[PDB]
Amino acid sequence: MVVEHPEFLKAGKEPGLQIWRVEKFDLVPVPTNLYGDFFTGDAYVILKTVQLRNGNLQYDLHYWLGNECSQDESGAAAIFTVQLDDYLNGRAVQHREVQGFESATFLGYFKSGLKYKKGGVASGF
């Protein structure tokens, strides 16, 4: 169960916000400058790393499901969130975020507003 995937190594190394998009059975890091703009036809994974006073880190994993995102993507997102949690010693809290029914917290991360945009990368099947 030990994952050697580069993004897991970079996963939660310091406080901040980290985003990935599911792309044909693989996590790919979104450009820092495109954070907040989501393709409604794809599935994403979001990791919020918060600095605890005890010196340790807090983790909250949110997997976002676009309306038009394919089943391979929705399934991948969920499995990847289950994997990232284990990788970070089961410490993270798993959150399922659907398009339009996001939790206050998840909406709260984006300061300049969360935007949707139609389209998205193809399915892996």
Binding site: L65, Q71, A78, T81, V82, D86, G90, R96, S123, F125
Partner: protein
């Protein structure tokens, strides 16, 4: 390239990891003389000269000698690949005995020489297929029915409910009440017909008493069906009485409680905090769940058991005959899952016991 294989009681789902569906599906049956053996349709067609057997009883592998035949047929006959050239992912029933898990692994490496393998639980894959980590699944195939609650990725063995009631039982029941009506359905050939009827016309009744009252009064609920020889027959109140047995097991003379009831009991037997999410994510899997108005009749029955202010939501995707398989197809295709495999090297090192540590 990876291969996925869902070993059901009645049917064997199998294909390539990356496909949106299994390339091969057939009956989990092995026939030998009363080459030297037949599997699947070959066996059924030549049922008169062969002694048929089921190598999986209630989702548990009983006959290992025959189970090997099932797999041989899966590799060479159906899918047509070299087992030793492809990593093979298998599936199991929830609460699978330690012994099975090992014996299962052994066979793949020793008697088949696969380069890598893995064994995940069916119900879990179904949940992953719905794009969910936490939730309670209701997998009901031909052999058995289960209630597998899952939280943040992993199942909860203590809250698992098993039920010896499934497709085959409903088929057999249909035969009884349809004969009592007037027709005659007893032989092995006549069962297959009754099974076709089950899958085509049967449906779950929102309010049972109101349908029995509406059946007795008009004939707007009746349907016709053409047999193979030609003769036509009408099917009345037994459209919805057959699948009703799932909610009221007493119908076939059982002691067990309803599927809606077992679901509740399961959820109740979990931690108080995670109760809300199990109620809010009821995924349905397996084949004997494909009745029309099933997600509706459940949705109604559970809301009546659970608190008034509780949010409920039943899920039954159109592809729930293959949910299990599809979940695995996605899992086997992941880039991260390249490390999760059990390689031959690791099997030689540790032997069959390695399965217990690598796979949950």
């Amino acid at each position: 390239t990876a291969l996925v294989c869902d070993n059901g009681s009645g049917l064997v789902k199998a294909g390539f990891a990356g496909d949106d569906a299994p390339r091969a599906v057939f009956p989990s049956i092995v026939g030998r003389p009363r080459k030297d053996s037949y599997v699947g349709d070959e066996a059924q067609s030549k049922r008169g000269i062969l002694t048929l057997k089921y190598p999986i009883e209630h989702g548990i592998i009983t006959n290992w000698d025959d189970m090997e035949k099932i797999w041989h047929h899966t590799f060479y006959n159906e899918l047509r690949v070299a087992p030793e050239e492809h990593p093979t992912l298998l599936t199991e029933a929830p609460l699978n005995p330690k012994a099975n898990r090992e014996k299962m692994t052994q066979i793949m490496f020793e008697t088949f020489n696969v380069p890598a393998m893995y064994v995940a639980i069916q119900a879990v894959l179904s949940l992953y297929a719905s794009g969910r980590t936490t939730g309670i699944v209701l997998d009901s195939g031909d052999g058995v029915t289960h209630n597998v609650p899952i939280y943040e990725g992993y199942a909860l063995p203590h809250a698992i409910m098993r039920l010896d009631l499934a497709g085959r039982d409903l088929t057999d029941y249909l035969m009884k009440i349809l004969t009592e009506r007037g027709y005659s359905f007893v032989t092995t050939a006549e069962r297959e017909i009754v099974r076709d009827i089950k899958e085509k016309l049967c449906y779950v009744a929102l309010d049972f008493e109101n349908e029995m009252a509406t059946a007795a009064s008009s004939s707007s609920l009746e349907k016709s069906y053409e047999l193979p020889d030609g003769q036509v027959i009408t099917i009345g109140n037994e459209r919805f009485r057959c699948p009703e047995t799932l909610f009221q097991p007493s119908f076939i003379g059982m002691e067990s409680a309803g599927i809606h009831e077992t679901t509740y009991n399961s959820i109740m037997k979990c931690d108080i905090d995670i109760r809300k999410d199990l109620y809010a994510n009821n995924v349905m899997s397996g084949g004997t769940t494909m009745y029309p108005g099933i997600a509706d009749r459940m949705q109604k029955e559970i809301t009546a058991l659970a608190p008034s202010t509780m949010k409920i939501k039943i899920i039954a995707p159109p592809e729930r005959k293959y949910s299990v398989w599809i979940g695995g197809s996605i899992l086997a295709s992941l880039s991260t899952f390249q490390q999760m495999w059990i390689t031959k090297q690791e099997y030689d090192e540790a032997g069959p016991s390695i399965v217990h540590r690598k796979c949950f």
